[PDB]
Design a protein around this nucleic acid. Structure first.
Lengths: 271, 46
RNA sequence: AAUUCCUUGUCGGGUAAGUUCCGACCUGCACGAAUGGCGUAAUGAUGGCCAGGCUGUCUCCACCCGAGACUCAGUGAAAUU
RNA sequence: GCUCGCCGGAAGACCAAGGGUUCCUGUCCAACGUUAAUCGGGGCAGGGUGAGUCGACCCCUAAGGCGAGGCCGAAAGGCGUAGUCGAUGGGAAACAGGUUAAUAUUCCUGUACUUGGUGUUACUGCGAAGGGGGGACGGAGAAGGCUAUGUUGGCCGGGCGACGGUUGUCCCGGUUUAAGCGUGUAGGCUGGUUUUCCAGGCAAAUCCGGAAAAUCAAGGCUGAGGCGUGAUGACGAGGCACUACGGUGCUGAAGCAACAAAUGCCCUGCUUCCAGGAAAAGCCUCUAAGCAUCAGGUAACAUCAAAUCGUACCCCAAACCGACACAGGUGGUCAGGUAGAGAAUACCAAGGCGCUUGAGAGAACUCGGGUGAAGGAACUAGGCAAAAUGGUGCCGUAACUUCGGGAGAAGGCACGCUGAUAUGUAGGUGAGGUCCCUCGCGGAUGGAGCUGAAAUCAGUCGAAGAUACCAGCUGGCUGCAACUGUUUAUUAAAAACACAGCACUGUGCAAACACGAAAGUGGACGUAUACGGUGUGACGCCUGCCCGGUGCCGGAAGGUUAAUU
RNA sequence: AGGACCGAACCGACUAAUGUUGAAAAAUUAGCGGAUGACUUGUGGCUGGGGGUGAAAGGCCAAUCAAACCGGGAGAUAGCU
């Protein structure tokens, strides 16, 4: 549910929160936790390779099961948990043999729900099957690009993909970006959609909220000097040149895809 | 007013110590130059 | 007008007297809509203007309490030439 | 030595970092000390640092460093696996008293504790470079129970007053005692026990996880403080023989209660929030390969061992960083009294200091302050500076507004002391007694004693009662930026930069992009509700016309066109 | 509850005076801003010169920055003093 904070002070006037009472109000499952040290956008050379990264709250990594290869063993959802490493929520599931695992939380999955994976699994939300056995035209998420590699597509808060066609050993999918992509008809997918659709309705409301996320301020570039940025300076606000990144690329419509290795699984790139 | 030199023995040895100089080819050349000049104190070790 | 050269534009308000300030007029030298336009409560060691209180800021300075300046003993520099 | 003055959330006390003999004693005064110097952090000589428990070393790991093979690179070399290093973090154990000119939780006295080796005895499933548990963790807030500590009374010792009074509701001082061991309380958390079974924990497992039955409600874990013991001791104000008037033996009374109370402890708790909060070992368990009249394991007793290095002194400063015995800078710990909301402020305690030139004089002028007739911004670029306002309670408070604000708007009234209500009230604390009980650090009743606001009424002193220090000037119009923030260390703090929000655009994951001759790394252990770039800059109402030029995105006929042949 | 309010420590540096061969190669005195946070601080670590870092001033990178410091080419060159 989206809740608007009352304007008791500047910085709270425009804050909009996303409150989900179903989330577990306790510590996470310790056995599935790992250390996650921040980098500040610096690589092994010590140089800043990605700007605007630094600070933020300390976080611990949750080992999420993106493969879902535990076939034939039913599992029951124990609770939903908050994951600081991703926009979507996660669910702790207990299998019949006594093993526990973390999975992405679908739209309408709650505590006590039953899920299963495999070729013979039922067509229900939260169930993972090879896309060969999934009926065409259904909505799935956490799709595998290669068989047995782990889900890679449609993992965000409220994303999903639709199976459009299945001609031979491939299935055509419509990704959230609108691209029409085809992948092998042996990659696993999970029925339903990732459930956090309200995630996009939040409003940070102040500069400090962005800093909590580890995002550092962005300096435009027209406010710098010529030695620093192509947009340079000038007496006042001039900007008499075509928009360009640092390092000198147009970045106002110029395409940068130059892979060409596949260039065969794309049909309707987008727009 | 805080001045440039803030002593720290551990940092002094790690930056200019004898073992730090020996750790790199360029550092070993520093010792060779100082030995040729006849310096009494080769490094800041003590 | 943080933009108006002519210019202290013209009219009104405030003052005994207002090149600043506020409100209108439009002949916009040379405003104008995300290098955004026009408004806007709150906020500001931010720019401009007007009141009450307050006063040595001033008319116009007077006296007083301390540290130097002045004299004695000891120590004893500097720029420049 | 007697006075005076200053600091007292330090200008006192104890450390780290850093320094390295500056520490104590004797001796010297050339140089050093901004003067003299008998003195000194100065010269010279001698002396001084005592640890199984404090710290380091050591075991363990974070960021990160190095890195056998390996991958990559003209050479040099780069990255990185297994590993190995790396505290600012985790990991066994000592307290009080006494003592030196200079060291002490290190020496002495008293009383304790921890981890290992070996041996004896009794009883025995032991075994890891593997599994599980544990270690193990955020912000804010709220109380309740306590202690450090303070105040008063009682008790003990002493005192009877340089000037009126002072045998009393009078004055001064003391009234201290640890770790350890036993007890397991305020309070926090969790339902226990037994049996059977299983696709999980790389194999195994009696352990962890899961499932199904039976049987009981009391089981366990954690836990400040208090009490007992430690202690027939130690300490103890003051006396008494020695007393080079520098000081040592012996002796040494009281040593209780109430109240108040922390920012410390219970609390790594509890409640709540979103931004969702290290690792590894020690430790506790589980078995595998193995070993079984062995070896090993648990317990008792005895015995042995616990090495090595640091330990002086300064440490908000004359000893460290600033060329100086320099109005500078420097992290942690301790936190008394009166007033006070307070670690502000004023005066004091313990303790420490008067800052290494003085002596006179009482001109101009400069610096730092006090007061001022009448006028009150006439000063000036400008109310610069100065003056002024200043506390608590109650009454009262406009336009405008995003309904929160504006607002402490503005403005007004009351404040001391004494008595009474009430020989000290409301409230807080709580003894004895009585009763109950699973007879305990228990529960109920009970109210002694102690502590103690605020208000009303009456009286009373001064020019003035928030009297000192301390402690908002207020209101009206308007430009700019929404706001809190950031910035030219050392002439610019702003209207500049950030900002939440908005838009365009790129990016299908071996992502775009960035650092790299490369390997590779960041992006991201993320996956289009994501990430990069660009412009705009809360919010409200809105964002019109132009694609000729430049750029970008598509197009497919024709023209032109490189190497090559 | 709060990049909430008043206000010490703590972190800053808006105004004035003094100082300017200073006590100090940027400080002192009286006022002033923030003061639960985009806060502040100790220890250690990483980024290296056409490079780093930069809430962006051409700021900062050992009192030095429109290209640090040290050594070398080097007795660079100087139609100029």
């Amino acid at each position: 549910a989206v809740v608007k904070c009352k304007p008791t002070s500047p910085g709270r006037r425009h804050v909009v929160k996303v409150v989900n009472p179903e989330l577990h109000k306790g510590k996470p499952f310790a056995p599935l936790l790992e250390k996650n040290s921040k980098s500040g956008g610096r690589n092994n050379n010590g140089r800043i390779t990605t700007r605007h990264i630094g600070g933020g709250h300390k976080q611990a990594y949750r080992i999420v099961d993106f493969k879902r290869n535990k076939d034939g063993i039913p599992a029951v959802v124990e609770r939903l948990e908050y994951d600081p490493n991703r926009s979507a929520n996660i669910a702790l599931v207990l299998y019949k043999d006594g093993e526990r695992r973390y999975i992405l939380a679908p739209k309408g999955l709650k505590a006590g729900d039953q899920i299963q994976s495999g070729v013979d699994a039922a067509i229900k939300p939260g169930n993972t099957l090879p896309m060969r056995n999934i009926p065409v035209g259904s909505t799935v998420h956490n799709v595998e690009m290669k068989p047995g590699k782990g889900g890679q597509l449609a993992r965000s808060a409220g994303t999903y993909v639709q199976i459009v066609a299945r001609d031979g050993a491939y299935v055509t999918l419509r990704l959230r970006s609108g691209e029409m992509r085809k992948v092998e008809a042996d990659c696993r997918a999970t029925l339903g959609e990732v459930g956090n659709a309200e995630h996009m309705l939040r409003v940070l409301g102040k500069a400090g909220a962005a800093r909590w996320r580890g995002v550092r301020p962005t300096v435009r570039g027209t406010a710098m000097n010529p030695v620093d940025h192509p947009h340079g300076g000038g007496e006042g606000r001039n900007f008499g040149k075509h928009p360009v990144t640092p390092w000198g690329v147009q970045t106002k419509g110029k395409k940068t895809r130059s892979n060409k290795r596949t260039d065969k699984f794309i049909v309707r790139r987008r727009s | 007013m805080k001045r440039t030199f803030q002593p720290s023995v551990l940092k002094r040895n790690r930056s200019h110590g004898f073992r730090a100089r020996m750790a790199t080819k360029n550092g070993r050349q520093v010792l060779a130059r100082r030995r040729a000049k006849g310096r009494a104190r080769l490094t800041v070790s003590k």
